[PDB]
From a paper:
In addition, we solved the X-ray crystal structure of the DARPin F11 also in complex with the wild-type p632/p732 hetero-tetramer. The structures of DARPin F11 with the mutant p632/p732 and the wild-type p632/p732 hetero-tetramers were indistinguishable, displaying the same intermolecular contacts. This, again demonstrates that the mutations that were necessary for the in vitro generation and selection of the DARPins (by holding the heterotretramer in a stable configuration) were not important for the binding of the DARPins. During the expression time of the p73 peak a strong pulldown signal using the DARPin A2 was detected that was not present at times in the absence of p73 expression, while a control DARPin did not show binding at any time point. These results also confirm that the mutations introduced in the ODs of p63 and p73 to stabilize the p632/p732 hetero-tetramer for the DARPin selection are not necessary for detecting the hetero-tetramer. A detailed structural analysis further revealed that both DARPins bound to the hinge region between the first and the second helix of both p63 and p73 ODs. Titration with the DARPins yielded dissociation constants of KD = 10 nM for DARPin F11 and KD = 17 nM for DARPin A2 and a 2:1 (DARPin : hetero-tetramer) stoichiometry, while a control DARPin did not bind at all. C Addition of DARPin F11 reduces the complexity with only the p632/p732 hetero-tetramer being strongly populated. Some additional peaks of low signal intensity probably represent DARPin—hetero-complexes of differing stoichiometry but these oligomers represent less than ~20% of the p632/p732 heterodimer population in case of the DARPin F11 and less than 10% in case of the DARPin A2.
All members of the p53 family form tetramers in their active state through a dedicated oligomerization domain that structurally assembles as a dimer of dimers. In contrast, p63 and p73 form hetero-oligomers of all possible stoichiometries, with the hetero-tetramer built from a p63 dimer and a p73 dimer being thermodynamically more stable than the two homo-tetramers. Here we report the generation and characterization of Designed Ankyrin Repeat Proteins (DARPins) that bind with high affinity and selectivity to the p632/p732 hetero-tetramer. DARPins are small kDa proteins consisting of multiple stacked helical hairpin units in which certain positions can be randomized to select tight binders for a folded target domain.
Author numbering:
A (entry chain B), B (entry chain B): 352 to 397
C (entry chain C), D (entry chain C): 1 to 159
E (entry chain A), F (entry chain A): 357 to 413
Amino acid sequence: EDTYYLQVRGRENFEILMKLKESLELMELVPQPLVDSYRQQQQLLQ
Amino acid sequence: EDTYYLQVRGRENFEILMKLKESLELMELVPQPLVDSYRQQQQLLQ
Amino acid sequence: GSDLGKKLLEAAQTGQDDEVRILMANGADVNAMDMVGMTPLHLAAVNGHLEIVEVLLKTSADVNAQDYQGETPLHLAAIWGHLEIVEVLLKAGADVNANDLVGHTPLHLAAWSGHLEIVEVLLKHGADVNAQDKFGKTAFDISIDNGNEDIAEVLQKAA
Amino acid sequence: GSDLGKKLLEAAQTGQDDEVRILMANGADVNAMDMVGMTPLHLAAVNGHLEIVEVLLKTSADVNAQDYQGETPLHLAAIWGHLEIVEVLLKAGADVNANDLVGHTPLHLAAWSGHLEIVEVLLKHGADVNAQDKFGKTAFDISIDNGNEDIAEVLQKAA
Amino acid sequence: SDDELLYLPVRGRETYEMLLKIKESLELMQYLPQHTIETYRQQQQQQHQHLLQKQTS
Amino acid sequence: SDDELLYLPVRGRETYEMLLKIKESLELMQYLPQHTIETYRQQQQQQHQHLLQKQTS
């Protein structure tokens, strides 16, 4: 549906991108209220 | 040789990535001495 | 913060009951915080590990410990729908009306997730139905938004 | 910094001689700086626009203007191999021994690029062959590194 | 006891915002139950059934 | 007259470094002659001769 393929040179590069792919794909599963608490937290630290 | 293909959803997203593709591909053509001057400049501003 | 502290956070997260008991026996910090400020008790509540929650509640671990977002274990048991864990946190002295940074009570978060039995338990322990978040919204207002009609009507009956 | 200033930077960069003359007639700042601190004169030197360089050198524009990296128009004419531009900058009073932030002289940068005629011109105007960059390297040391044997031997003969 | 609080100096809005989206995604994973992770990871293992290849002709 | 000097606050080393590689690449383009740009851009126009497509079967 909205799946995207890419290609990367370098094992270290692939590993970083797999770490972030994971964390970015999982973000959709984080309840919005906890996201809102979190962004509140970041703004307070400014 | 070391050319890589990727796929992006969203015209605004494609435009940003084309801007950076340009600037990152052109970086190889910047003489190293001017790069070194530049990185010196950034360190001085710390 | 400490090696045993991180192992205990991870054992609590992953439901390693024997590991938890053994780390604690060896002096692991029960107030260890992960990168979002969660304690093993928070992580046991998130991941639904009732036995681990009961174990941690026999220690000095604060049942009302706040992570960096102001979430208590009761907020997170509530949002993830862990009814048994909600019940024992409340028995162990969980503040039913604890506020996170955007003014969510456990009731807001049970409302958000559509966890009916948990809304019922929170009301039973004196959840405040008239509490407003940062954005001026009650548990009710959020049940409405998220199309939780069961919970909408339970909340209106109580206000 | 100004609208005409940016247009003049871009006209100088892109070799739009008539545009340059017209922007200047209309009062465009000849000391306008781009995002790396380059003046129209810098950009005319980079891009090899001899006529535009000659035009700008009939104004108050500083022939020894430094960008944020300490590069003068003579550094950049040198590195990009614009012999005619090097010659007129030197005639217009370009400091042959100007230092950028990492201690490169125009001679270092002509050495780096393997521009033989330009090394010759820089020596002729009194380039200092014994000048060391941040990293302790002469024009000579850099000709060696970059396999510029012609220029290596010209530099050794002069030291 | 808390994780060490380090600070990252970032030149510019754009790099900052980008690093913020990244940090946010890495941190907020902590709030996910393992049932959710394990569901994700089985979804991912099943993507491997059909592997990526560069096509030709 | 100089470009406006803005500052971008960035939480963390990693986002900072990333935004720095980006900014650097965007700024240092200024040092390239148009002959070099035009060479690049003709190289790029010629990549279009052979267009990218998702292959099937």
